[PDB]
């Protein structure tokens, strides 16, 4: 099976080292995700069956609360730390939303392909982000939260919770990739 994966235990102690430029990688990488976004969200809700595309805002409302904050201004550090959390956050939940679709819609290779790359790139932005958040910054370890789905129980909900999450993601990347 295809394995996405986003590390929780990140550390200037233990992480994978990097290439050059960095900031302009995570700029590129960032706004890259912003590309897929729409289509991957389209793709998600698309196959969750009817009546998902007709109640798009009631069900897949850019909404799921408790979400890791982002502030518009503030020093590189702030932006970078803050982002880092959001990343941790999606990729955690984003894996799950897949491991769902892996058994609900195991036919749309179309969806996985996306879901899967949108995790790969997401993982990079991460190491690349902390890789800077460590060279001339020295935080040591970004303290973090884990995404949704302890259970989630009902098929149904697992769709809503994934339709919602993807919703905000779409809504959030569009900020992120503009700010820095």
């Amino acid at each position: 099976s295809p394995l996405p994966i986003t590390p929780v235990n990140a550390t200037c102690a233990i992480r994978h080292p990097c290439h050059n430029n960095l900031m302009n990688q995570i700029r590129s990488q960032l706004a890259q995700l912003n590309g897929s976004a729409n289509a991957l969200f389209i793709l998600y809700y698309t196959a969750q069956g009817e009546p998902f595309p007709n109640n798009l805002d009631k069900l897949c409302g850019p909404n799921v609360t408790d979400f890791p904050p982002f502030h518009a201004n503030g020093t590189e550090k702030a932006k970078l730390v803050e982002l880092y959390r959001i990343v941790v956050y999606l990729g955690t939940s984003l894996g799950n939303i897949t491991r769902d679709q892996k058994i609900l819609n195991p036919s749309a290779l179309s969806l996985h392909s996306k879901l899967n790359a949108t995790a790969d790139i997401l993982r990079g932005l991460l190491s690349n982000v902390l890789c800077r958040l460590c060279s001339k910054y020295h935080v040591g370890h970004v303290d973090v939260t884990y995404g949704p789905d302890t259970s989630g129980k009902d098929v149904f909900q697992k769709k809503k919770l994934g339709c919602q999450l993807l919703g905000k993601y779409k809504q959030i990347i569009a900020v992120l990739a503009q700010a820095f």
Binding site: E50, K102, F156
Partner: protein
Amino acid sequence: DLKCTTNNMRVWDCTWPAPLGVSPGTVKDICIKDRFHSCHPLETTNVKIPALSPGDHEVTINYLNGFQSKFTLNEKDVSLIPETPEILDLSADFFTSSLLLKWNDRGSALPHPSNATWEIKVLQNPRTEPVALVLLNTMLSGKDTVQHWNWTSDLPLQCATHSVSIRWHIDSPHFSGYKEWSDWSPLKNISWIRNTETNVFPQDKVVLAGSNMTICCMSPTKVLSGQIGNTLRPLIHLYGQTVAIHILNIPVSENSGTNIIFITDDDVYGTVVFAGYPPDVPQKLSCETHDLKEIICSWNPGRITGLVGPRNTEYTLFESISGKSAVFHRIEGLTNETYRLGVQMHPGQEIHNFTLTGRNPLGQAQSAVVINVTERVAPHDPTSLKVKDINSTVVTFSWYLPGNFTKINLLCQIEICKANSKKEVRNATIRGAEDSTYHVAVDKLNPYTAYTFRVRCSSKTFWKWSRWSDEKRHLTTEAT
């Protein structure tokens, strides 16, 4: 003239009116002549006596001072109004929206072979019941019976709490008086102890494609809409804005399942249901063997059941005589294509009883076949042809063919194709063995010529040919 009653058919509860002319509670004896001369005490005008012998009896009642009353009494004045039976327990299933009702047939207290009948009666929150249905029950003398009733919720799934009730009526061919109807049991109440947040039922159910299924909604807020996949249904108020819809007749959901959702002004509560076809009798079934290690069975799924992973059918192939067996489960949906299942066989054996059982949480399907293995030997394709010179006019053509063939012997073909000539094909037989190289002497050749070889194999008992080999291509040789 002295009207009677009984709970069981053992004791009469008889009351008479007083003989007018101020004689009130001045009652001494009540005497009966039957079995012996027995005489019972009194506090007032009515009394508890043992049921007597069919026929007429002198029942006299004595009063203190003077008087005394003379009463002709029988078995056919007496009526039999049975005791209220109590419901022993009311365990209820939630997964299947169903009830179980168990009571005490007090058959210990009711004589000899006696047919007795029960009017059970359910109910929810509306002014009348769902079901009030009656059980035939013949009773066994002496031994109390612990009889059950397994009823199932037509409509919702316990999101709306039920009451149940039961009255019983005894007959006896060894009793003569008005066989009478008892009265209703004290009602029995079952309830939801909310397990989860969830508020619409039932979740995750799998049902038969096109099934008049009913679904319900526990709600805080006056529910505005109820719909399956955009086709909203006319929804019907049950009690407390908690409401329900009928899914008329259900088309087989896709992989993601059909969605049924409710919307109130505020939030959105919804449910997935999977609509299914049970698996179909699996089709073009035929097993063979390419090696003599394992048997393989080709077969076609049939009508595809429209379901996925956990639900997708689980085909299981079962060799009877062996005991050996294997299993098929694909998460992705099945096709019109044909799949094969890789079963082992103990050395040789032969007789083979195959049972392919497709299961899928809705129904079963099964076809069988019977195979003389050593009659199905239809080997892989031969490989790695080496050619070795012997004389000018002769060569050692040899290859390697996978399979335990020690019991059997195969006969192979040799397409000796030479340049610009007809295809010379040779049919020689060899003794086979364990995953081994095979050797053929090939003769009547031409020295120093453009040869090409092909090998093509099967058992001398033959099922079907190997594929055709590759290309051996060799020259010949000289003397000086």
